[PDB]
Amino acid sequence: SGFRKMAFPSGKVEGCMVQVTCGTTTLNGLWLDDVVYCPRHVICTSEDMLNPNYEDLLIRKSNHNFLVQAGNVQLRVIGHSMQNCVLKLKVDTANPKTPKYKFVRIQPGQTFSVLACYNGSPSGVYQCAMRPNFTIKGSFLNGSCGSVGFNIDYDCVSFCYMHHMELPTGVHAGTDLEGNFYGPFVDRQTAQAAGTDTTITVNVLAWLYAAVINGDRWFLNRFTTTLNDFNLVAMKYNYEPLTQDHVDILGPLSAQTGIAVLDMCASLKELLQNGMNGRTILGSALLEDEFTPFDVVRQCSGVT
């Protein structure tokens, strides 16, 4: 029993982190096979922050200008190319610690672990969610760029995020491993306001099922609702609309607990309307939305 914000074991990803330096800028890179992936803003200087022309800046760079260090040993760069907002540095050596991997572009509401790194070295691991406004609420300092987000299925690492920047509001923006930003963000120091950060309704419901499985049941009520009635409440509280696809994904949790999805929606509706009255659920005083239905099942079943 017990329910924690759990991250995947980070070992497989730690073995891929390298330090990339170009000129006087240093950030993290991801070494998989004979390619090092890193944010293309590694080529930017202090004056190439406001409006950089990456193609023009990249013409002034050769293979020897990219210094790639894995631990204390230097990697030989034999090629470089730009794909969207990432640089791919071909090196002459395949990473011997390369795990089985995939590149995935996640949907908003999905969760993943981040291995925060600085100068190619891992500092910590934590669990995140891609917000509906395509930002992530991370913990990243200067030099953390190139740190990656990932999920693991037995022995396969699915990389989904690469950190690029911090918006002026303290939230984080980045790309998939093809260099395409999540959301409308650009790798430029400009006014980029984030949109409405709505609550991930299907995740809050999954967490309420996790609470029931663990003994926190005070919020269960004698009521039920409909998808349309619940969604009128969700819109009022800036919660994402709940669809039949969401109800379907909550099916195993509904079956395990014996609580119909719509009955759980009615408990959520009452919690939104009345608040928690100073009470807690799974050690939290607010409704947690960074656990997907898959995460709840995984943690509650012990998937290794």
- Shortest distance, CB of residue 114 to ligand VEY, whole angstroms? 12
CA atoms within 13 A on the CB side of 81: 6
Q: By CB under 6 A, tell whether 166 contacts ligand VEY.
A: yes
Considering CB distances under 5 to 8 angstroms, the limit depending on partner class, which of its own copies, ligand VEY, none binds residue 112?
none
The two beta strands, 156-166 and 100-103, are parallel
Nearest to 162 by CA among 292, 17, 44: 17
- Shortest distance, CB of residue 118 to ligand VEY, whole angstroms? 9
Exposure class string for 90-121: b at 16+ Cβ within 10 A, else e: ebeeebeebbebeebebebbbbbbbbbbbebe
Point out which residues pair with 32 in neighbouring strands: 35
- Active-site option among 145, 163, 164, 246: 145
Q: By CB under 6 A, tell whether 116 contacts ligand VEY.
A: no
Instruction: Give the angle 229-232-237 at the CA atoms, nearest 5°.
Output: 130
Which residue has 């099942």 as its token pair?
297
Q: By CB under 6 A, tell whether 288 contacts ligand VEY.
A: no
- Shortest distance, CB of residue 133 to ligand VEY, whole angstroms? 17
**Size of residue set near ligand VEY by CB under 6 A:** 15
Residue 163 falls in the annotated catalytic set: no
Maximum C-alpha span of the chain: 69
Q: Residue 15 and residue 7: Cα distance in Å, rounded?
A: 17
Q: By CB under 6 A, tell whether 240 contacts ligand VEY.
A: no
Q: Residue 25 and residue 169: Cα distance in Å, rounded?
A: 24
- Interface with its own copies by CB under 8 A: which residues? 1-12, 14-15, 115-119, 121-126, 137-141, 143-144, 166, 170-172, 214-215, 275, 278, 280, 283-286, 298-304
Q: By CB under 6 A, tell whether 165 contacts ligand VEY.
A: yes
Considering CB distances under 5 to 8 angstroms, the limit depending on partner class, which of its own copies, ligand VEY, none binds residue 286?
its own copies
The count of other CB atoms within 10 Å of the CB of residue 240 is 20
CB contact at 8 A, 114 and 148? yes
Which positions from 36 through 65 interact with ligand VEY, judged by CB under 6 A? 41, 44, 49
Q: What is the DSSP letter of 37?
A: E
Q: Which of 31, 134, 140, 239 binds ligand VEY (CB under 6 A)?
A: 140
Q: Which is closer to its own copies, CB of 124 or CB of 184?
A: 124
Residue 145 falls in the annotated catalytic set: yes
Q: By CB under 6 A, tell whether 142 contacts ligand VEY.
A: yes
- Shortest distance, CB of residue 260 to ligand VEY, whole angstroms? 28
Q: Residue 57 and residue 45: Cα distance in Å, rounded?
A: 10
Q: By CB under 6 A, tell whether 143 contacts ligand VEY.
A: yes
- In one letter, which amino acid is 183? G
293 class by beta-carbon count within 10 Å (0-12 exposed, 13-18 middle, 19+ buried): buried
The CA radius of gyration of the chain, in Å to the nearest whole number, is: 21
- Shortest distance, CB of residue 142 to ligand VEY, whole angstroms? 4
Considering CB distances under 5 to 8 angstroms, the limit depending on partner class, which of ligand VEY, its own copies, none binds residue 285?
its own copies
Q: By CB under 6 A, tell whether 137 contacts ligand VEY.
A: no
Considering CB distances under 5 to 8 angstroms, the limit depending on partner class, which of its own copies, ligand VEY, none binds residue 284?
its own copies
Contacts of 284 (CB under 8 A, 6+ apart): none
Interface residues with ligand VEY (CB under 6 A) are 27, 41, 44, 49, 140-145, 165-166, 187-189
Catalytic (active-site) positions: 41, 145
